[PDB]
Design a protein around this nucleic acid. Structure first.
Ligand SMILES: Nc1nc2c(ncn2[C@@H]2O[C@H](COP(=O)(O)OP(=O)(O)OP(=O)(O)O)[C@@H](O)[C@H]2O)c(=O)[nH]1
Ligand SMILES: Nc1ncnc2c1ncn2[C@@H]1O[C@H](COP(=O)(O)OP(=O)(O)OP(=O)(O)O)[C@@H](O)[C@H]1O
Ligand SMILES: [Mg+2]
Ligand SMILES: [Mg+2]
Ligand SMILES: [Mg+2]
Ligand SMILES: [Mg+2]
Ligand SMILES: [Mg+2]
Lengths: 930, 937
DNA sequence: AGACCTTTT
RNA sequence: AAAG
């Protein structure tokens, strides 16, 4: 249809090119809108392209590309490894990535843009078959609603699925067949392709001598389909995620070092419930290898990983006394019947490790359930608001005090935000014209050279702008800070030492709150929950008990394997395969909470349909033998693509839940439990085969939830109280009755304070030192006077340019600033013996010359009060030099001229700031080195 | 006796001109007169009214024909003037040093040198009676070569009288002596201002006349302590002088005075809680708040009234009420706890984050003695030395390959925050930082590579040599799984005998393994010094959740016959720290020994037990009798304190003999260990041990009058016959010395010139000017020759100290200036007159550059020490590239507040080593959730 | 063959 | 300069 002819043609003159140039050569043709199946250019393969280490070399002279724009270039390390590294480098895989619907012409549905070559973390499938044989795209689903579409035909969804799954796709000399799809402004889904055949493929192992292999065979290698025909084919397709999961290959274990359990840990109450879903033990030696190959400073107590068909958490055996390598699996972890024979089905693959915990706070989503469970809902609301007002008042107060002393404000500006990542990537603080491009680095840059925010109004104004903006972000983003809270990986107690409703929490280091610190939790009640929390029982109050038996297990929370039901299931139906629990030991949050029982979930079979058709049932429609199994696999893919590309009712029903519970001000009434139970059965929609369409979502809303098809937005979604009377919902109350008035009071104070000759000014006699010293010379000279007059006028012309291009009002703002800065640097002695001393030519950077100091000093005096931004935008660099030189005092130490790189590697000494202000306040001798 | 004639006019004379003067100037006007040798009584005189309201010493001192020292810090001076000698706990100290005068004419025997006004942490007595009323001196001991003949003939008793029988007059004040302790060997003596011209029979210059006999009665309440031996009583005055941070004044109803210590459950009567009591969690929180601590301290070392010792948080305190308890073992005298200064918690130290310790020479003999396989123990300790050396050198050699990595390493090798805070800048000697670490980072921050510039290479070479030479001498073999930790008793009876509880306030790191507590392992506990074979004990670490709150402390059981602390060289829980080791390679071969059968040395150890009471029956009863007895106690105890200490001689003897015998467990070793154990407590326990007693003990039990030779390891090289067999000889000469020489050759081999075409670019710039200008050539020429004269002055093996010598040469270096050389437009551009710091002008750069060219190889230490600051400026100017960022000129103060960011180094080097797409280390790449995976599947 | 050690305010 |  329109879809046909969408893919780029491979010109038959690159048929010998390595696929690395072939991918990058096919990109330049696209971006430069040039056909490649034409003799118009007379193009032919330059053998110089093989052995290349830069894509730029390949791109470099002909008519059709002369002057056209260049596309983003793949980085050299990826290209080198692409050409000479067999697409793998240090556990990373070179990725063939691509990504849209704009011309409504009846005869190409999509505009395809190939994305550059790039490194990403490999997976089992790329480590077994080669990264070059995998290709991913981002394509918009036919089952979305926002209109960008021609959709406007009934069977388009089937047609789109037919294009991707029915047959092979030709690109870069390789035949790509689709094997997986999952959801990643329009909703776009990620589709994965495998290179089944190619030009350089042997019809029977380096990148260019790949034996032809079919997707049906690749998937049969991963899932061992013969022994898993009993599985529903939609769940079988979902297990392909385990093969695509970006994991760190750790080690390969031998069959005799693997303990396949046939039974899970079941409830001691005979209820049959599994108390260890997704969790197994590993040896202390295996954990040590995880540390060694990943570069960690400590043996991880627990890891999230995969191992053959097994998926979940693995935790150190506290009772491991030897140093023999081993690992165990359970049925709850094993997602398909696997023989664990190939070394890739026996490699421990780590997704992440349980690392040090940082404070989580209390996100607003939990407050309705915490309010539903408060023994006194009026005190809890009062306490949460008092906590918020105090935190806000503390934040605003701590800012104003730091402004009084420049060493203290430097801490604050450093603590407030973070530029390390930018400093590492640029090897320096990046500068826009004459100042750092960020406002935080500009404040610290200028204060490092002696400028005071309480004295220099340019600094006062910038510090004013950031606090205005922090205030404006605090009333769109509401944050209830709870120091004694963290998200922690959930682990089960294999050793039966934890009683029902007892939990073990030990930290790997000091967990700091303002007034207390912890290395473990003991003899206190804690609140555990999984986010999001829906049912009133989705948050549970339990007893933290520190068991010395488990002391070695750190940065995990351990739940009891006693009792009727595992605690992880009561937390929104969770388990121990990577789930994290919100853990709160803040007494003010815990002591009000009363536990609710698990609700009676309603029967929603009338609305929720499950397709449980097995691989066997899908295969018997084709017969028996290899070719039948091979066809059923391709069917499994196609039938699963319709389901994956279906609408996201999990998101729609969750947004309805938020609104329903808001307008009703209830999370425990019958509508809320029905909705919570519904979104619970929709988390696994693709996996457990839940077919749920708009019409089923229509009945349920009208029949069972209150009749409303569409519910209003909650008021807290707006940034101003558009409600009637005092807020009633707890979140509305916290945003508009507590936070908003408090933020406003500081903003009012800000303008009122902004409104005396006693204050911060633009003028600084230090900054005009060079202007005056020359005037003394110029007034007694003729030559100096001419240079001075020419320079002063020259600065004026650039100031005029700044006003038109940057101040008053196309080309982007940084580019305009740079254009004026180019003219600013252009002011020079050459354009008008003294000239040599000012120029200092032996210096490569003209900006480091004395001329630049005089140019800055002269521009300052002439424009410090009419055009302040112009002087600092162009010459703050030299203004800071002048300030540091002028403020130096003989015998009072020595200023230091840091290089750009060495500067970016320094940070404020927190212990210096505290200790220095202490000495100034007369507390000269207090307790040392803490 | 005359000494007595030379003990007349010792203290400076107080004229009538300064009678009105405040103690602050009267002290410091006296100081200058003495330094410049101008008599206070010179008629060749009016008080300056300006001096009374002065806030700076230079104003005092500038106010004259005769005048052509160290100045009291300007803040301390204001406190002495207007803050009543007391600024936020710190006290202004009146100090002085006395030496024997070379003049042998029987003129003053001692030469006084009043030390400048300074700040020190106050104490109970200064806070109660005023810091102005206390004077402290260092005086030579009269019981000591170099001793003057007048003292050598006849003298000790004549000096002691001069100190104790009368008041001495200084700065308008009459000072009586009240305490003395051992600081030629010198003794520290403390005085109390009993009267003065300004005194009357509160303000500093309006002080009621108070006597030493009463000052001591307030502190010790002597009426209720006549039963104590008067020497022990005198030693308790040190509790009133302990430099302490006053935390809070507790009320009487909050103080629980226990009357019976915790005793052994076996009926032996042994005390299991000596020096240790409990405190409320609230009291601990105020300690945190008053001292500015980040966390709540579990345990503290302090004093409360008559109580001295450790106070630990009560783990059962669920309330918010402030309370403290005292025990008999803590209370050093009968106290009523009525005055608020006798009810104030005073803290000397708080239990804090522990650091890894090192093995010491004292512990190794005992460790070998108790080893079941000595060969294994030796191999392990040596192997620990060889691998510890190998890491140190490998960590540094790698670090030298990148300036950002070596700056990180230098910053981590030494912490200079205190000197930075103290000065508000990095202290500079001439044109480079004082410290070597700070010199390296200063030059690296301006663009110098420590592997390309030889001057930096030589500094790091010299610095690593000094540490290696220290490891040769000390053998402080670092052991990661070890630390010194305050000892505490288990009030709650959950620990069994030989079970200890150790929990850390944070992660304690040892290479591969890290710990927040100790559990299920054996540990070694020992107190330094270790002498007896029983002075180290193998015990079991058991973590008890009931004691989880107590951190950075080691808890011992209160069950069992004898407290484990007592088995550690007779230690207790009043401040004692234990060497704690959980290294399996060190712990698992140790076999405990029973406490030693100490021999009777009463024959030579004479214990004066005279009580205050018997000392007073020579006077009768009543206040006048008490006052006399208290002044008797001072004089008699000064006699005992000023007496020679033989612990150094007897410990040095035990070392030399036990080395000869290679045994710390035979009869002479038990004898000498028992002897040194009594000598440490001599002043408190009143044991007289004369030279004759040491002579008699040596001749009857220990080898006689023979002077024992020094052990081999006291020498740098093995001059011994054969192969080293003593474990210290073995480790220093067979292990350390060869391994250090091998790691050193590798270090140098890995490591580069003094020349730098950038550092000589200003020289070249004016070389091209001086050719087309005879005037510029004259300046240029004059400047060159001026530089050489300074270099000659710098250079040879000098009574003046090294910094003073360098500063002198530096001042003639800065003297070079554009003095007349005729084109003024140029002289001004070089001069940069507007700048106040002349070392910031363009001339100082050229002076540095020109010096560099004429002397990069010749005398290299000259140009760097003088002009290294300007050499750094030229480097950072030259190495700047257009558009590649901006160099930064940072003030001295702001520079001292920055530090290297470990996370920047690790991220930058990882990004640069190609391998930056691997696992995100949480400590390098930090709702609080970090890395949870690379994708979604 | 010649007068202690340890780690911190 | 302390403390053990
Ligand atoms: N080697 C050595 N050890 C010392 C020295 N001074 C004190 N010690 C040690 O400190 C111990 C004294 O402990 P303290 O806490 O001061 O006092 P105490 O023995 O408990 O006695 P009380 O003050 O009555 O509780 C003994 C020694 O082990 C010294 O100069 N050298
Ligand atoms: N008979 C069955 N009927 C329905 N679902 C089943 C059946 N047997 C197993 N399952 C499903 O198999 C899935 C395998 O668990 P899996 O680890 O994939 O889920 P999860 O713990 O929710 O995942 P994650 O926390 O890693 O996002 C479960 O969701 C479970 O419901
Ligand atoms: Mg699971
Ligand atoms: Mg899960
Ligand atoms: Mg004691
Ligand atoms: Mg005692
Ligand atoms: Mg003690």
């Amino acid at each position: 249809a329109r879809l046909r002819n969408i893919w780029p043609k491979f010109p038959k003159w690159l048929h010998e090119a390595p696929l690395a140039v072939a991918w990058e050569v096919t990109r330049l043709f696209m971006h430069c809108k040039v056909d490649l199946e034409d003799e118009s250019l007379g193009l032919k393969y330059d053998p110089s392209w093989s052995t290349a280490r830069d894509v730029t070399d390949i791109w470099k002279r002909l008519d059709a590309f002369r002057g056209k724009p260049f596309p983003e270039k793949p980085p050299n390390d990826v290209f080198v490894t692409a050409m000479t590294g067999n697409f793998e480098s240090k556990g990373s895989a070179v990725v063939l990535s691509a990504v849209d619907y704009p011309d409504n012409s009846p005869t190409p549905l999509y505009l395809v843009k190939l994305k550059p070559l790039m490194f990403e973390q490999g997976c089992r499938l790329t480590r077994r078959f080669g990264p070059d044989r995998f290709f991913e795209i981002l394509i918009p689903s036919p089952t979305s609603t926002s209109p960008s579409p021609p959709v406007s035909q009934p069977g388009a969804v089937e047609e789109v699925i037919q294009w991707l799954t029915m047959g092979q796709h030709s690109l870069v000399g390789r035949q790509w067949r689709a094997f997986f799809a999952k959801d990643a402004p329009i909703i776009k889904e990620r589709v994965h392709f495998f290179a089944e055949t190619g030009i350089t493929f042997r019809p029977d192992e380096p990148v260019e001598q790949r034996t032809e292999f079919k997707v049906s065979q690749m998937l049969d290698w991963l899932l061992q389909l013969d022994n898993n025909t009993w599985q529903p084919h939609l769940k079988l397709f979902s297990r392909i995620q385990l093969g695509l999961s970006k994991t760190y290959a750790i080690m390969t274990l031998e069959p005799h070092q693997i303990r396949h359990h046939k039974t899970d840990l079941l409830s001691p109450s005979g209820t049959g419930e599994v108390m260890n879903d997704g969790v197994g033990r590993m040896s202390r030696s295996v954990a040590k290898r995880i540390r060694d190959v990943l570069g960690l400073g400590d043996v991880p107590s627990a890891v999230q990983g995969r191992f053959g068909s097994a998926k979940g958490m693995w935790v150190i055996d506290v009772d491991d006394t030897g140093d023999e390598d081993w690992i165990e699996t359970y049925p709850s972890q094993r997602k398909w019947e696997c023989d664990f024979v190939d070394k890739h089905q026996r490699t421990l693959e780590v997704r992440s490790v349980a690392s040090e915990l940082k404070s989580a706070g209390l996100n607003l989503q939990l407050l309705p359930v915490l309010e539903d469970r408060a023994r006194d809902k009026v005190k809890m609301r009062q306490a949460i608001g008092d906590r918020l007002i105090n935190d806000l008042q503390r934040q605003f107060s701590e800012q104003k005090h730091a402004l009084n002393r420049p060493v203290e404000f430097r801490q604050w500006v450093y603590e407030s935000y973070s530029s390390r990542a930018t400093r590492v990537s640029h090897g320096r603080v990046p500068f826009l014209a004459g100042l750092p491009d960020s406002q935080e680095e500009t404040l610290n840059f200028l204060m490092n050279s002696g400028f005071d925010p309480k004295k220099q109004k340019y600094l006062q104004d910038i510090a004013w702008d950031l606090q205005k903006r922090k205030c404006d972000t605090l009333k769109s983003k509401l944050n209830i800070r709870v120091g004694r809270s963290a998200y922690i990986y959930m682990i089960a107690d294999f050793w039966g030492v934890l009683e029902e409703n007892e939990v073990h929490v030990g930290f790997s280091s000091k967990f700091r709150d303002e007034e207390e610190s912890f290395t473990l939790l003991s003899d206190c009640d804690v609140l555990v929950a999984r986010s999001p929390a829906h049912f009133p029982s989705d948050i549970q109050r339990v007893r933290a008990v520190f068991k010395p038996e488990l002391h070695s297990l750190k940065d995990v929370i351990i739940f009891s394997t006693k009792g009727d039901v595992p605690l992880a299931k009561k937390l929104s139906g969770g388990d121990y395969d990577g789930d994290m629990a919100w853990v709160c030991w803040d007494p003010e949050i815990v002591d009000g909470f009363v536990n609710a029982e698990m609700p009676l979930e309603p029967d929603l079979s009338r609305y929720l349909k499950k397709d449980k058709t097995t691989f066997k049932q899908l295969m018997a429609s084709h017969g028996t033998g290899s070719a039948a199994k091979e066809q059923t696999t391709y069917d499994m893919i196609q039938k699963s693509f319709h389901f994956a590309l279906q609408p996201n009712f999990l998101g729609m029903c969750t947004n309805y839940k938020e609104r329903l519970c808001y307008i009703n001000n209830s999370v425990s009434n019958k509508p809320a439990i029905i909705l919570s139970s519904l979104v619970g059965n929709l988390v696994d929609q693709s996996k457990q085969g839940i077919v749920f369409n708009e019409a089923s979502w229509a009945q349920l809303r009208r029949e069972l939830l209150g009749g409303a098809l569409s519910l209003p937005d909650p008021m807290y979604k707006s940034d101003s109280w558009l409600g009637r009377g005092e807020p009633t919902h707890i979140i509305d109350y916290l945003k508009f009755s507590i936070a908003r008035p408090a933020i406003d009071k500081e903003l009012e104070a800000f303008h009122n304070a902004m409104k005396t000759e006693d204050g911060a000014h633009f003028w600084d006699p230090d900054l005009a030192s060079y202007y005056t010293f020359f005037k003394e010379i110029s007034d007694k000279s003729r030559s100096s006077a001419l240079l001075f007059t020419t320079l002063k006028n020259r600065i004026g012309e650039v100031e005029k340019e700044y006003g038109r291009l940057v101040k008053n009002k196309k080309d982007p703002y940084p580019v305009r600033v740079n254009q004026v800065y180019e003219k600013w640097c252009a002011i020079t002695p050459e354009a008008m013996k003294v000239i040599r001393l000012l120029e200092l030519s032996f210096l490569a950077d003209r900006e480091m010359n004395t001329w630049a100091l005089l140019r800055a000093s002269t521009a300052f005096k002439l424009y410090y009060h009419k055009s302040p931004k112009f002087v600092w935008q162009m010459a703050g660099r030299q203004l800071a030099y002048i300030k540091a030189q002028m403020t130096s005092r003989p015998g009072e130490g020595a200023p230091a001229l840091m290089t750009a790189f060495m500067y970016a590697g320094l940070m404020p000494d927190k212990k210096f700031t505290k200790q220095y202000v202490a000495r100034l306040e007369g507390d000269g001798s207090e307790y040392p080195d803490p």
